[PDB]
């Protein structure tokens, strides 16, 4: 099983960026997708319940497109690497990586 990503992104302050991943080559069903950084939670997409968006990001993150998410009003402090953690039924755990650079 493999994950393909948007690819590393360079954006400017105040811009908007989509972070998306695609799970390929697997017979596994996706129960939940966690969007995270090394130390913080951005959003979770759960198949049974729905989306959860961490209060830190509720002003500038919208669910979608698909199992991805959209960032508004990019700041330089966003510069970092973002993870799309796919939790599949029931073995689980596929991981994708996307670095965003701002200025």
């Amino acid at each position, epitope marked *: 099983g493999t994950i393909e990503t948007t690819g590393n992104i360079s954006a400017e302050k105040g811009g908007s960026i989509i972070l998306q991943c695609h799970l390929s080559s697997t017979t596994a069903q996706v129960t939940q997708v966690n969007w995270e950084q090394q130390d913080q939670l951005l959003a979770i997409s759960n198949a049974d319940l729905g989306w959860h968006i961490s209060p830190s990001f509720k002003d500038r993150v919208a669910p979608g497109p698909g199992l991805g998410l959209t960032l508004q009003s990019l700041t330089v402090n966003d*510069t970092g690497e973002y993870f799309c953690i796919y939790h599949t039924y029931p073995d689980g755990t596929y991981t994708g990586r996307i670095f965003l650079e701002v200025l």
Partner: antibody
Framework: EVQLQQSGPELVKPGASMKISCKAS????????MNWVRQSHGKNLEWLGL????????SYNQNFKGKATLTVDTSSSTAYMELLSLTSVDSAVYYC??????????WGQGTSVSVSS | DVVMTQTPLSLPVSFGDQVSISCRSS???????????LSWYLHKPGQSPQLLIY???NRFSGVPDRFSGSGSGTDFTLNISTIKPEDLGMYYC?????????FGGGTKLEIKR
């Protein structure tokens, strides 16, 4: 202009852990990522990871999980790299290099680290 | 991980010639916004690696105009209009579109005889 001075060469015994420094000058140190490259056998290049000095965020090549640790001291525009539990296979030159739009436009002179018993 | 296969690994050359290095990527180096983060690097023996060309075709500040870069998708090329004794060394292609960043194998320019 943009200058990146790395620390000197070091011979250590296997099992030891040492810290390489990279003092930056000539640019806003927190506005750019500080990357680290390994040069093996004189020929092969390997991207080890980077640190974004503005907020301390790190990203690591997972082929080398737990081999390096990246830190910065912003009050001295110094980036650091701690190599851990070194073996002979880790005898190489380790480069400091600034990151701009996913290219490395300025490099340090390199730090030759030798591991031998 | 993207595997950057570089070709040839060694090239004996004549000063005044036109050299071409091809870098071939195991998958597309374009993000969803059409930015392709491929750079070319040069490491002369006495020195530290220096950036020559970034994002396929853009020439870094200070690089002679003999150096030019082309290609798209999954194969890229470095053009040297006229090689001088100072152009010798080892050349590397690097992709930074996909974590982790991976380098090419490297091409070593030599003297033909």
């Amino acid at each position: 202009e943009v200058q990146l001075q790395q620390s000197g060469p070091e011979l250590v015994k296997p099992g030891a852990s040492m810290k390489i420094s990279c003092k930056a000058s000539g640019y806003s140190f927190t506005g750019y990522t500080m990357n680290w490259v390994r040069q093996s056998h004189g020929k092969n290049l390997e991207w080890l990871g980077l640190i974004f000095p503005y907020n301390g965020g790190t990203s690591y090549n997972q082929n080398f999980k737990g081999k390096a640790t990246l830190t910065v001291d912003t009050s001295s525009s110094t980036a650091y790299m701690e190599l851990l539990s070194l073996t002979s296979v880790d005898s190489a030159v380790y480069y400091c290099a600034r990151g701009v739009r996913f290219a490395l436009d300025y490099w340090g002179q390199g730090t030759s680290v030798s591991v031998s018993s | 991980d993207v595997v950057m296969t570089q070709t040839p690994l060694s090239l004996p050359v004549s000063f005044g010639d036109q050299v071409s290095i091809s870098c071939r990527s195991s998958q597309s180096l374009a993000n969803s916004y059409g930015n392709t983060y491929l750079s070319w690097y040069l490491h002369k023996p006495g020195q530290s690696p220096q950036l020559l060309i970034y994002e396929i075709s853009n020439r870094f500040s200070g690089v002679p105009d003999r150096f030019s870069g082309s290609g798209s998708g999954t194969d890229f090329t470095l053009n040297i209009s006229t090689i001088k004794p100072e152009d010798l060394g080892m050349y590397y292609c690097l992709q930074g579109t996909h974590q982790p960043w991976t380098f090419g194998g490297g091409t070593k320019l030599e003297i033909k005889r």
